[PDB]
Symmetry: C2
Subunit: 310 residues, 2 copies
Amino acid sequence: MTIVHRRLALAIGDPHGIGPEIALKALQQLSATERSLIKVYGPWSALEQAAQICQMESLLQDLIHEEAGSLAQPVQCGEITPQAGLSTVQSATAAIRACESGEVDAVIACPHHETAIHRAGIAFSGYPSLLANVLGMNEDEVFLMLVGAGLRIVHVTLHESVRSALERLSPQLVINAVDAAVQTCTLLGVPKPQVAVFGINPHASEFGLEDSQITVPAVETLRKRGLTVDGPMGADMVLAQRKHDLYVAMLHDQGHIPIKLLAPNGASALSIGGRVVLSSVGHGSAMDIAGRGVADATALLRTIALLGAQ
Amino acid sequence: MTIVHRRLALAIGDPHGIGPEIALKALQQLSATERSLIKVYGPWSALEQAAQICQMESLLQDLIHEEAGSLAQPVQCGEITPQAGLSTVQSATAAIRACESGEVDAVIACPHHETAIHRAGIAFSGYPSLLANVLGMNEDEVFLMLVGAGLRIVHVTLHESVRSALERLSPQLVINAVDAAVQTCTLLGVPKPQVAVFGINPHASEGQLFGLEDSQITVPAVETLRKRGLTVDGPMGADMVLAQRKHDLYVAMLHDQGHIPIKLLAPNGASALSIGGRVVLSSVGHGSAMDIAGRGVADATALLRTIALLGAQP
Ligand SMILES: NC(=O)c1ccc[n+]([C@@H]2O[C@H](COP(=O)([O-])OP(=O)(O)OC[C@H]3O[C@@H](n4cnc5c(N)ncnc54)[C@H](O)[C@@H]3O)[C@@H](O)[C@H]2O)c1
Ligand SMILES: [Cl-]
Ligand code: NA
Ligand SMILES: [Zn+2]
Ligand SMILES: [Zn+2]
């Protein structure tokens, strides 16, 4: 079973965490041809360390690697350090830039440690903010798509009060979300996606003017551009039908609830802006087991299978 | 075995619809003792008609019945008529009043037809509004609880714009919703539930990082409920709490927060309880089915399921 069919960047995350170890364990499971499609971004010293502990030194010769987030001192597994935090952001930044320039088609970031990044004096509020910052766009133009249990749901807004989200919603914002999400769908192996747009208000207002001002004009424009788009519709109703390859959530909770319920441990979070698709694996850096050789690479392999489709 | 363990009122709905027919088919499946706990409200003429079509005349002689929503003309199955609309509201009103007075412990309303009611000149926007109107309370003090697939979710607000819902949210509104929902839980066979309150904003505002609403509304409300001795968690992010699945009752601030989980897990299976004062009123999960009324082919499964839910052992 080949799971990688396109070029991918893998940023190895916090070099003191389990990110290095799971990168190797993942790459080990792949064939030689698959390995050559994955470019690893991170400090060599950490990959060396993990390879020694896990006894996978012979794998290192086959890795395609680019030095990023170099360390000035030896790797200290399990230790939260500002240096490690800087490393994480640099590795991820270099992967993103490689996707931006067309060297790879998508990026996977191994687990970061939020405290490490903060201690380096780096502002970080998630991959959507980082991706925007690196690509030099506004946070408004990078969207989060959750993928889990068959469902794909792009969020037009995220991480702000409901009132604040309502004030920012516009037809253009919804259109930009869908364009970004449709291009990502192509990458996930769905060329002609059937799109469903959630209503802002219950039953898509059939209960306020917001949908007539926002979601209705947006769907009209998308359809004129030749997209197959239904809605606005009541979130609850459309989801239940299970007739669509992509759903467009207006609000955080509309999109987050379905995914956490159906896919408690199988959900991917894709950050999407410009040409770039960045997934995390859905777990932390596990400092209590780092350097002890007990980390499993299942979540990383799942992320690779999803982004590596075709 | 027994699915009915307390007294219920059954309002038979639009008498031209399938409501009469499914009431009989349901009662047929129950034992004699169970049948004697269900008091049927509606026009006798419609039950007679349905009994003839379904060949259940001998069942009618056992039925506990109160005349409500009498008709002035023969039943015309399948036909939308104002008279039928008036009938529906009268039957349902009489069942509600029987629950209000303590004659029954809960109410089931069989399917109505919205057009019929409107043509009778009667304002109707759902059972929450009717229940409020009959009990003489405001629509703000009657709440909708969805039940399906182990989930129970009461909605603090319901069928209104998000903006409108946000403007009405207050600590007291949240408290009233929970009180109503807790008393209903007792009736559903879970006394003293473990309650989870959803946040208004994502992540329950994460303190105050994503708006002040939760600090002003859900936090003081939970504090008050806990001081009164209730086991209540939150506010928490809706998505997060639901995923845990370790609470008997959830409190949704907004329509979609509560409706999405239920339709996902229980695509058909979900009951909608209107709760006001001491009265709990469920619908059956379907319409009056005018196209098949009076042909004897309607399924009673949804009614039986509603009876099992409201009829549960204390
Ligand atoms: N309560 C109401 O508001 C109500 C009732 C009847 C009709 N209507 C009007 O007609 C539309 C559709 O309503 P509907 O009556 O078709 O119901 P529905 O949408 O709830 O159910 C779909 C169809 O399934 C069948 N069905 C439903 N319950 C059944 C049962 N117990 N046994 C066998 N078959 C059953 C009927 O043919 C029904 O038409 C509504 O959108 C409305 O405009 C409304
Ligand atoms: Cl490559
Ligand atoms: Na911190
Ligand atoms: Zn979130
Ligand atoms: Zn509804």
